[PDB]
């Protein structure tokens, strides 16, 4: 679908209903169905993440296998074994298809150039708190489809949105 000379930029995240995506340096729920969904969308593509999101990756999947891991940092000496570190967004989006995988800061940074969002909404009532990382706000150019609610094996309810724009 994507012409190979172009640069499709997508954002992928899971959020509570409130928009909270991160808290205390972690994701404040566990949803294996969404872990699998995240792998399914991102596999075989370049993935771009902020340094704090790299830090938060489970050690057994750091770097995330099967994907070119790109970490944004202002720390020139940052050690990200098995990934590459860039100091600006410009050098991070040179691939034909790129998925931005977090966190709050880097979603906001990449949002102007994104034409796809894959959003998991978790039906968990976490009100916004000081310090939370938050999902980006999507303007009126976005459109998309809302999936049906499903229960995870644990009983946590979630649904998938697929957004796109020109
Ligand atoms: N629910 C989800 O889908 C999801 C996904 C990913 C992450 N998370 C969670 O989100 C939280 C992390 O998000 P966050 O907003 O705090 O941090 P982040 O976006 O993951 O990383 C921020 C770091 O990225 C670097 N950075 C940001 N802008 C930059 C720029 N213009 N140029 C160069 N470097 C830049 C800086 O690294 P340096 O400080 O090293 O300079 C900055 O500290 C965690 O809680 C994580 O668990 C949730
Ligand atoms: C899985 C959490 C998550 N979900 C969605 N839909 N989008 C995201 N961007 C996202 O964050 C992923 C990066 C930070 C957390 O990283 C992980 C947390 C738990 C498991 C995994 C491995 C998943 C399987 C794989 O991708 O190989 C990453």
Swiss-Prot record:
Transmembrane segments: none annotated. Substrate binds at residues 12-14, 34, 39, 67, 107, 120. Its EC number is 1.5.1.3. The keyword NADP applies. SUPFAM superfamilies: Dihydrofolate reductase-like. It catalyses: (6S)-5,6,7,8-tetrahydrofolate + NADP(+) = 7,8-dihydrofolate + NADPH + H(+). Keywords: NADP, One-carbon metabolism, Oxidoreductase. Signal peptide: none annotated. One of its GO terms (cellular component) is cytosol. Inhibited by isoniazid metabolites. The prodrug isoniazid is metabolized to isoniazid-NADP adducts that inhibit the enzyme at subnanomolar concentration. GO terms for biological process: dihydrofolate metabolic process; folic acid metabolic process; one-carbon metabolic process; tetrahydrofolate biosynthetic process. Pathway: Cofactor biosynthesis; tetrahydrofolate biosynthesis; 5,6,7,8-tetrahydrofolate from 7,8-dihydrofolate: step 1/1. Residues 8-165 form the DHFR domain. NADP(+) binds at residues 13-14, 21-26, 50-53, 72-75, 87, 101-106. It is an enzyme of class 1 (oxidoreductase). Key enzyme in folate metabolism. Catalyzes an essential reaction for de novo glycine and purine synthesis, and for DNA precursor synthesis. Belongs to the dihydrofolate reductase family. This is Dihydrofolate reductase. It comes from Mycobacterium tuberculosis (strain ATCC 25618 / H37Rv).
